[PDB]
Structure 1
Amino acid sequence: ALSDGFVRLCIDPSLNFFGEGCKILVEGQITDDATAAENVVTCVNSELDLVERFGQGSVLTESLRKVFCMCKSGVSVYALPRADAAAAVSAVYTLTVTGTALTDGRVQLYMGEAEYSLDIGVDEGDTPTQIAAKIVAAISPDFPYEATAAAGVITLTARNGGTIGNHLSVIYTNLGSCTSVTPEGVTVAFAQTTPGSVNPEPNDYASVVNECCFAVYVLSSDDTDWQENLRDWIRSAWDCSKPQCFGHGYVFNKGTLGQVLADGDNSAELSRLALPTTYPVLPYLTNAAYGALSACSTCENPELNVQGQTYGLLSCINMPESCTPGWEFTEVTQLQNNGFVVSGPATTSGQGNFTSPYIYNDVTNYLRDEKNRPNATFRDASSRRLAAATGVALATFLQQFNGLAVFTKNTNIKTGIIGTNLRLMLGKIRKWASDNVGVLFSEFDNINEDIQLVSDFDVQPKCVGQPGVFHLNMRYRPPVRGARINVNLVPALFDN
């Protein structure tokens, strides 16, 4: 500002990024080489700092990579690294190459996600199984698995311990008439040899995220107990015993239909994502994409629903088309009716070509009630966002009565006094509630009965109440998302 070129006006810029009103927290494992301190929340800048700050090929880095690629700008990211358990075992996979390449050709593989795909050319004809397996020199460094390149067989070992390394299904082109000049006489076999053993169970959420507000929690793990702890923490943020911080969490569950349905703990604070047993993409990558997309990078408007092929398109994920739907339609309906989220391809094909997934229903895991009755009050995720928005907005509006003289037991206000009474206060609140129809509420069934204001003197018995304390009781309803109109066709062959 203050400069040599004096002129009527001075200017003063400070920095580029300004959208700090939206926050997202990503939690996951790390490796040994990571320099970040464990169990300490730290802000995350662009992708340049990654790898070094969280290790090479660690679960956390992969999750963060998708988060940044989905939300280019408009949200602020945070990371909460965690370390492996004391005695965690690392999963091991085997991929044996057999036969001698007797023709010139190329070999290409797809594992985990499209970013890790490779394509190398067979050196020449008559290359044995040992000169082959050069794939190891081609696998990208970011792959969470380490290739050893043994004599004739390549071994993949998870870089992180625990059960998180028990998900894979490879797609290759080394057989059939798919002659991308395929090397004739080569074959590949896939098999597992050792599973993961032990997961961590952190329970110090009250100390590391204490009294700090976050919008969306993302958890890159599949341990049921770990997820349960996150749900309990979120409840505390929505509790009535202290000022609320609000928030929402995203988790995933994988397995057969019988297994997935068994995780329905009836939590309105979580949005469980259901995946089949043969998902061709690493699970947590899809979960991170869904969380980031709904992590206010699009949901600055609480009313918005993250559904459909237009708004709920997880573009960053690319996966080859499967030979079978995976989730049979008779099973898709059951999952939706039970409060789960189901995703599927956004384009039509069965060729094994590349597509992207999208989300059918944006629904939480809410069922029944505290009194055990069934209802859909918190069915849609937008209800949770709208409820939080109403709470904040309502508190701001009522702020104008702070420090204002209030008259009771004699409602006539002298001339020149600045004050108000119960009836005037109630009337003003009604005005605010009505004006918001179409923005935060739908038309009230009976606006004269869903709002009540009573002074504390009328609640407590004689000589027990306090002067200048009111109780406000309000009931509302979010907007209406559609209705059914049964039709009755009639051709009326006769005339008149």
Structure 2
Amino acid sequence: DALSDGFVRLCIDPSLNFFGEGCKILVEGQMTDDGSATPDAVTCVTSELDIIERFGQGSVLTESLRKVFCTCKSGVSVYALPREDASVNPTPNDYATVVNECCFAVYVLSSDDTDWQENLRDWIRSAWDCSKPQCFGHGYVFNKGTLGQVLADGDNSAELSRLALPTTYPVLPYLTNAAYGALSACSTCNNPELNIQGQTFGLLSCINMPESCTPGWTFGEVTQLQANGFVVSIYNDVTNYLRDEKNRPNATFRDASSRRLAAATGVALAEFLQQFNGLAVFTKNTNIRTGIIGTNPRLMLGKIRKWAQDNVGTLFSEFDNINEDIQLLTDFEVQPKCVGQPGIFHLNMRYRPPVRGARINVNMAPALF
């Protein structure tokens, strides 16, 4: 049939898949033993077919991943950590063993227990530490309760996006939470600049909440939540930071967009610097010979600056004083020469998220003629 020869070889399959998966969200939640699968074991689940008898029918995880499996149609690689059960809330979980170097971008924890949330926080912040192996993860957790409680039941962590919910919210909390994370991932896991807010870029699809008149957090409470932190719905996709080491105002690490772009710059500079391996870096005579591949610390700083002067506008913003924001000091330079050793260098930059749009106060004042 003109296909006998052997040149073309066609497979007409409806359920094909070409996408380069990426986008490796993890979902954590308690389970019912109906799910035939080893607990405390990361399982990169497929689409629905391998369902409730894989994680536990009925239990929170079921609905959570259902919403997640929902939302995003294509783009993510869903991962599940089906924790087991036991004022009960069996949450204990110091488990950097089961989940390890294999790194996940988005995290969603369907449990209002402060301890579990804080443990996830610690794990993420550990991943986000100066330690040379990096993957730059981010989590999403929910938090119900009254205004006083919501405020009190919080922290400084900027590695989560703790969602606030009034004690009237019809939908079961964790549900929305999952959806939120889901959307974010599948949306931003290629473009980090995007920010999930407004109506078009962020409306949770799988919610279908019953409409009413009395919304929830009144305007005052809305301001309280927003300023303080939480991502009251969606609008204001910030990460509760509100502070810093000592001085409170640290606008930089407020938006999630800022955090994703910072991770992007980190991985870009990491995959870029690797062209300075081998090389040979003269540091005493600062005079490379003729015919030998080599570089000098000053030359390296020049290269770094040139680089940081191209990604500007797209990753960084303006670099006010380039002469000071980017500094490269050699081991021998800082340390008075007794404890110096060629090979060690110190680079320090100044991240400035590209300024975005915000409120536009209007003061239209009518008159006649």
After TM superposition, is the score higher than 0.5?
Answer: yes
Give the helix-richer structure, 1 or 2: 2
**DSSP 3-state at the match of 1:206:** coil
1:471 paired to 2:346: yes
Residues of 1 paired with 2:41 and 2:362: CA distance? 59
The answer to whether the 8 A contact 2:281-2:294 is kept is: yes
The answer to whether the 8 A contact 1:73-1:297 is kept is: no
Residues of 1 paired with 2:257 and 2:47: CA distance? 29
Q: Could you say if the C-alpha distance between residues 406 and 363 of structure 1 is closer, same or farther in structure 2, counting changes exceeding 3 Å? A: same
Match of residue 292, structure 2, among 375, 393, 417: 417
Residue-by-residue CA offset, 1:130-168 (whole Å, 9 max, x unaligned): xxxxxxxxxxxxxxxxxxxxxxxxxxxxxxxxxxxxxxx
Q: Could you say if the C-alpha distance between residues 220 and 309 of structure 1 is closer, same or farther in structure 2, counting changes exceeding 3 Å? A: same
Q: Could you say if the C-alpha distance between residues 225 and 404 of structure 1 is closer, same or farther in structure 2, counting changes exceeding 3 Å? A: same
**DSSP 3-state at the match of 2:104:** coil
1:279 paired to 2:154: no
The answer to whether the 8 A contact 1:404-1:419 is kept is: yes
Q: Could you say if the C-alpha distance between residues 203 and 470 of structure 1 is closer, same or farther in structure 2, counting changes exceeding 3 Å? A: same
Match of residue 261, structure 1, among 120, 144, 151: 151
Q: Which structure 1 residue ranges, 5 or more long, are not aligned?
A: 82-195, 343-358
**DSSP 3-state at the match of 1:266:** coil
Deviation, 1:213, is 0.5
Residues of 1 paired with 2:14 and 2:57: CA distance? 37
Q: Could you say if the C-alpha distance between residues 18 and 224 of structure 1 is closer, same or farther in structure 2, counting changes exceeding 3 Å? A: same
Give the strand-richer structure, 1 or 2: 1
Deviation, 1:397, is 1.4
Q: Could you say if the C-alpha distance between residues 292 and 468 of structure 1 is closer, same or farther in structure 2, counting changes exceeding 3 Å? A: same
Residue-by-residue CA offset, 1:392-447 (whole Å, 9 max, x unaligned): 10111111110002222223333222212122222111111111112101011111
**DSSP 3-state at the match of 1:489:** coil
Deviation, 1:201, is 2.1
Output the TM-score relative to the length of structure 2. 0.90
The answer to whether the 8 A contact 1:75-1:297 is kept is: no
The answer to whether the 8 A contact 1:25-1:218 is kept is: yes
Deviation, 1:373, is 3.4
Residues of 1 paired with 2:253 and 2:128: CA distance? 14
Deviation, 1:235, is 1.3
Output the TM-score relative to the length of structure 1. 0.68
**DSSP 3-state at the match of 1:40:** coil
The answer to whether the 8 A contact 2:23-2:189 is kept is: no
Residue-by-residue CA offset, 1:216-254 (whole Å, 9 max, x unaligned): 110111111111111111111112245223211111111
Residues of 1 paired with 2:213 and 2:296: CA distance? 70
Residues of 1 paired with 2:47 and 2:257: CA distance? 29
RMSD: 3.3
User: Which residue of structure 2 lines up, in the alignment, with residue 86 of structure 1?
Assistant: none
Q: Could you say if the C-alpha distance between residues 41 and 492 of structure 1 is closer, same or farther in structure 2, counting changes exceeding 3 Å? A: closer
The answer to whether the 8 A contact 1:205-1:233 is kept is: no
Q: Could you say if the C-alpha distance between residues 282 and 467 of structure 1 is closer, same or farther in structure 2, counting changes exceeding 3 Å? A: same
The answer to whether the 8 A contact 1:362-1:381 is kept is: yes
Deviation, 1:52, is 1.8
Residues of 1 paired with 2:114 and 2:174: CA distance? 14
Identity of aligned residues (%): 91
The alignment of Structure 1 onto Structure 2 pairs a total of residues equal to 364
Quick check: 265-274 or 1-10, which moved more? 1-10
**DSSP 3-state at the match of 1:213:** coil
Q: Could you say if the C-alpha distance between residues 202 and 10 of structure 1 is closer, same or farther in structure 2, counting changes exceeding 3 Å? A: closer
Q: Could you say if the C-alpha distance between residues 324 and 484 of structure 1 is closer, same or farther in structure 2, counting changes exceeding 3 Å? A: closer
Deviation, 1:14, is 13
Quick check: 196-205 or 391-400, which moved more? 196-205
Residues of 1 paired with 2:18 and 2:264: CA distance? 24
Q: Which structure 2 residue ranges, 5 or more long, are not aligned?
A: none
Q: Could you say if the C-alpha distance between residues 240 and 298 of structure 1 is closer, same or farther in structure 2, counting changes exceeding 3 Å? A: closer
